[PDB]
Amino acid sequence: GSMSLQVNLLNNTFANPFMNAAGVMCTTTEELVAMTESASGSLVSKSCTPALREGNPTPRYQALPLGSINSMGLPNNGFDFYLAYAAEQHDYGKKPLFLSMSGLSMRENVEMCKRLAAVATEKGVILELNLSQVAYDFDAMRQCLTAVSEVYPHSFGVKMPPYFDFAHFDAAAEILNEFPKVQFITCINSIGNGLVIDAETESVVIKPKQGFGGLGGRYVLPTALANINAFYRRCPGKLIFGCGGVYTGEDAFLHVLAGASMVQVGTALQEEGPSIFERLTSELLGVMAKKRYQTLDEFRGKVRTL
Amino acid sequence: GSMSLQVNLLNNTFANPFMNAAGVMCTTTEELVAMTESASGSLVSKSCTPALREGNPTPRYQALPLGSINSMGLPNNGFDFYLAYAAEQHDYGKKPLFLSMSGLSMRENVEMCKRLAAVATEKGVILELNLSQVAYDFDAMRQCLTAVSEVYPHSFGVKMPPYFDFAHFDAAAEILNEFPKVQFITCINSIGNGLVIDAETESVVIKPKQGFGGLGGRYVLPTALANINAFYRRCPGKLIFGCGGVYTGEDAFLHVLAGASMVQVGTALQEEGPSIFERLTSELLGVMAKKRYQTLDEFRGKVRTL
Numbered sequence: 190g191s192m193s194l195q196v197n198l199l200n201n202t203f204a205n206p207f208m209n210a211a212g213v214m215c216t217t218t219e220e221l222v223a224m225t226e227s228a229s230g231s232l233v234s235k236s237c238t239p240a241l242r243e244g245n246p247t248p249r250y251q252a253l254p255l256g257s258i259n260s261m262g263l264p265n266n267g268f269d270f271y272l273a274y275a276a277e278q279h280d281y282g283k284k285p286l287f288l289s290m291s292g293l294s295m296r297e298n299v300e301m302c303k304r305l306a307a308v309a310t311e312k313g314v315i316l317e318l319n320l321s322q323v324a325y326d327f328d329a330m331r332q333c334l335t336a337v338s339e340v341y342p343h344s345f346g347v348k349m350p351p352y353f354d355f356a357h358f359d360a361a362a363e364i365l366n367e368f369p370k371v372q373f374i375t376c377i378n379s380i381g382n383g384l385v386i387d388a389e390t391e392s393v394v395i396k397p398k399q400g401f402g403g404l405g406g407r408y409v410l411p412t413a414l415a416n417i418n419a420f421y422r423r424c425p426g427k428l429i430f431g432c433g434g435v436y437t438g439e440d441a442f443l444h445v446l447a448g449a450s451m452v453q454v455g456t457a458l459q460e461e462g463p464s465i466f467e468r469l470t471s472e473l474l475g476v477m478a479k480k481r482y483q484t485l486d487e488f489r490g491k492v493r494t495l
Numbered sequence: 496g497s498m499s500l501q502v503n504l505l506n507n508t509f510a511n512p513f514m515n516a517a518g519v520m521c522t523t524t525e526e527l528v529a530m531t532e533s534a535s536g537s538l539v540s541k542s543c544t545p546a547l548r549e550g551n552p553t554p555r556y557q558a559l560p561l562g563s564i565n566s567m568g569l570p571n572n573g574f575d576f577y578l579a580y581a582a583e584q585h586d587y588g589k590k591p592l593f594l595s596m597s598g599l600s601m602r603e604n605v606e607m608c609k610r611l612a613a614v615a616t617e618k619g620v621i622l623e624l625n626l627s628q629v630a631y632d633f634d635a636m637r638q639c640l641t642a643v644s645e646v647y648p649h650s651f652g653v654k655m656p657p658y659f660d661f662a663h664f665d666a667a668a669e670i671l672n673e674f675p676k677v678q679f680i681t682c683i684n685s686i687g688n689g690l691v692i693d694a695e696t697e698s699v700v701i702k703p704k705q706g707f708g709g710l711g712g713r714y715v716l717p718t719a720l721a722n723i724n725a726f727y728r729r730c731p732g733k734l735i736f737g738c739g740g741v742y743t744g745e746d747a748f749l750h751v752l753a754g755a756s757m758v759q760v761g762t763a764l765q766e767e768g769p770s771i772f773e774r775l776t777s778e779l780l781g782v783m784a785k786k787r788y789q790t791l792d793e794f795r796g797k798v799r800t801l
């Protein structure tokens with residue numbers, strides 16, 4: 190009978206594991222408010238750079254039968270804006286808040302983190318540092334985490350690009366394991382630089398980068414699951430946030446089974462809007478009721494191998 | 496008007512660009528014969544090691560709604576077998592033959608190539624060197640190609656794992672461009688180490704490697720197109736063979752638009768059997784008819800960017 194999607198991590202309680210994926214429906218005040226008013230357990234603001242960015246020329250996003258492709262190019266209101274939202278506007282009474290940071294250089298991250306620190310202390314906003322590029326360069330990654338850890342006296346998480354072999358899972362996990370402050374790992378950012386071609390128009394579907402763009406949605410689910418689980422296994426001291434290919438409570442069930450604590454929703458949210466969180470909570474509860482699970486902790490990470 | 500799927504490359508004529516992906520339906524004599532008797536323009540033998548390999552424990556392949564996952568583990572009849580097939584049995588009158596080679600070390604590839612050379616000379620079998628792991632380690636990749644190029648007195652092709660960013664496309668192309676004997680690049684091998692989880696059983700679906708395995712099929716098409724196109728652009732001296740996500744003539748059309756000369760079919764072929772090539776040729780012809788193309792040359796690599 191009695192079930193709960195409650196998640197507890199980083200001294201916070203989340204009503205449920207769902208949140209937007211960074212960059213989806215979280216750029217403007219209006220979006221952040223809608224995410225906060227939504228049934229989501231949490232939200233994360235658009236990955237920010239120190240100054241506003243208009244991002245790439247349009248079209249830079251295309252929804253697809255099997256997901257999405259994008260090359261948004263970090264359009265965002267700038268760090269000050271997301272800092273102010275976290276410091277002054279966000280209703281922490283409603284749900285915890287993650288702030289995604291994507292400085293274009295290590296120095297930019299360091300300088301933003303210096304300023305984020307006080308707000309994290311005061312309001313409890315949690316950094317998701319977008320490493321996804323940095324995450325495909327392990328030396329740079331360690332360097333970056335060192336620099337940020339030096340100036341940011343709080344736990345935070347990293348948003349990772351997907352990896353595709355155990356050597357990379359091992360190497361990434363080894364670096365992340367060097368940093369106790371990295372308390373969560375978000376797997377995954379989009380599968381990088383896919384190329385969608387529309388057979389009718391015989392063209393690509395997005396303008397930037399000759400049509401090459403990050404894949405999200407149903408394309409990425411097994412890759413997301415792999416990475417969630419790969420890091421779940423290799424970083425037992427950390428939590429994993431799942432991101433990639435979640436359209437239904439069943440998809441979310443798979444993320445959690447693979448090891449996810451929070452489950453982020455990108456493409457599906459972009460296509461459906463924040464009402465999706467009511468559906469997803471209801472669907473995950475339904476999947477759990479059918480499977481006789483009462484809590485997420487009961488099956489998180491418990492995917493059975495053969 | 497008159498249409499033709501004919502492809503001319505590597506001093507050969509192909510009735511059409513279709514062939515099996517290495518490792519699919521090309522391990523046994525019967526499979527090779529069936530591929531030869533099929534409507535495909537060519538075939539490639541299962542990636543071989545010097546000796547017979549039993550491969551990984553089963554289940555090691557699973558068909559999925561969006562494609563497939565596998566960790567076959569190079570089950571193959573051994574090099575002598577594929578070499579003998581190429582030397583003694585294959586009917587080159589029907590179609591050219593590619594031999595896929597995947598030695599477990601540089602040494603093995605060298606020794607097999609040394610022996611393959613004569614059969615390539617006499618019979619015209621074309622090596623597809625499986626680099627896909629080696630191709631994710633650019634030094635190992637350089638070393639592998641240097642070694643093979645040193646001992647193997649023929650043009651050959653390389654089967655590439657997918658890359659996911661331009662830095663990698665550039666790095667790989669730079670390396671490939673340093674080897675004039677590499678005259679085709681097959682993009683792509685499976686998307687590595689996805690993890691399929693069956694929500695019903697709460698388990699992975701293949702046994703080896705904790706359920707992690709290469710993704711093929713619908714999952715991989717934009718990644719395949721990206722890679723085909725990325726290397727099509729960066730290796731203008733070379734042919735690109737497309738592989739990944741081809742189930743229909745329209746998919747094939749996308750491959751060719753992206754730059755593919757040959758189009759390899761794995762997952763779809765696994766599920767449908769070699770009769771698929773009759774459907775694929777018909778479908779591709781139909782797509783070309785509706786679009787008023789008469790030859791593949793007319794649109795190969797002509798994907799329009801915005």
Ligand SMILES: Cc1cc2nc3c(=O)[nH]c(=O)nc-3n(C[C@H](O)[C@H](O)[C@H](O)COP(=O)(O)O)c2cc1C
Nearest residue numbers: 210211212236377378379405406433434454455456
């Ligand atoms: C339009 C769009 C914008 C995105 N912006 C960001 C971003 O700013 N920062 C980030 O880390 N990921 C960003 N992502 C990637 C998502 O956070 C997520 O990692 C990816 O889309 C996979 O999730 P999905 O399959 O639910 O779409 C974006 C994705 C999309 C489609």
Ligand SMILES: Cc1cc2nc3c(=O)[nH]c(=O)nc-3n(C[C@H](O)[C@H](O)[C@H](O)COP(=O)(O)O)c2cc1C
Nearest residue numbers: 516517518542683684685711712739740760761762
């Ligand atoms: C069962 C199976 C066996 C495969 N064996 C090989 C192989 O031996 N050598 C190789 O280069 N690729 C192998 N592959 C990868 C395919 O050749 C192809 O690169 C990949 O499956 C993507 O094509 P697809 O989407 O049509 O399946 C195999 C794939 C599958 C599913």
Ligand SMILES: Nc1c(C(=O)O)[nH]c(=O)[nH]c1=O
Nearest residue numbers: 260261262263264321379403
């Ligand atoms: N910053 C990101 C973007 C973007 O284009 O802004 N798109 C993504 O898919 N992932 C990111 O991390």
Ligand SMILES: Nc1c(C(=O)O)[nH]c(=O)[nH]c1=O
Nearest residue numbers: 542566567568569627685709
């Ligand atoms: N050798 C390969 C296999 C295999 O399992 O043998 N599976 C793949 O997906 N790709 C390969 O190159």
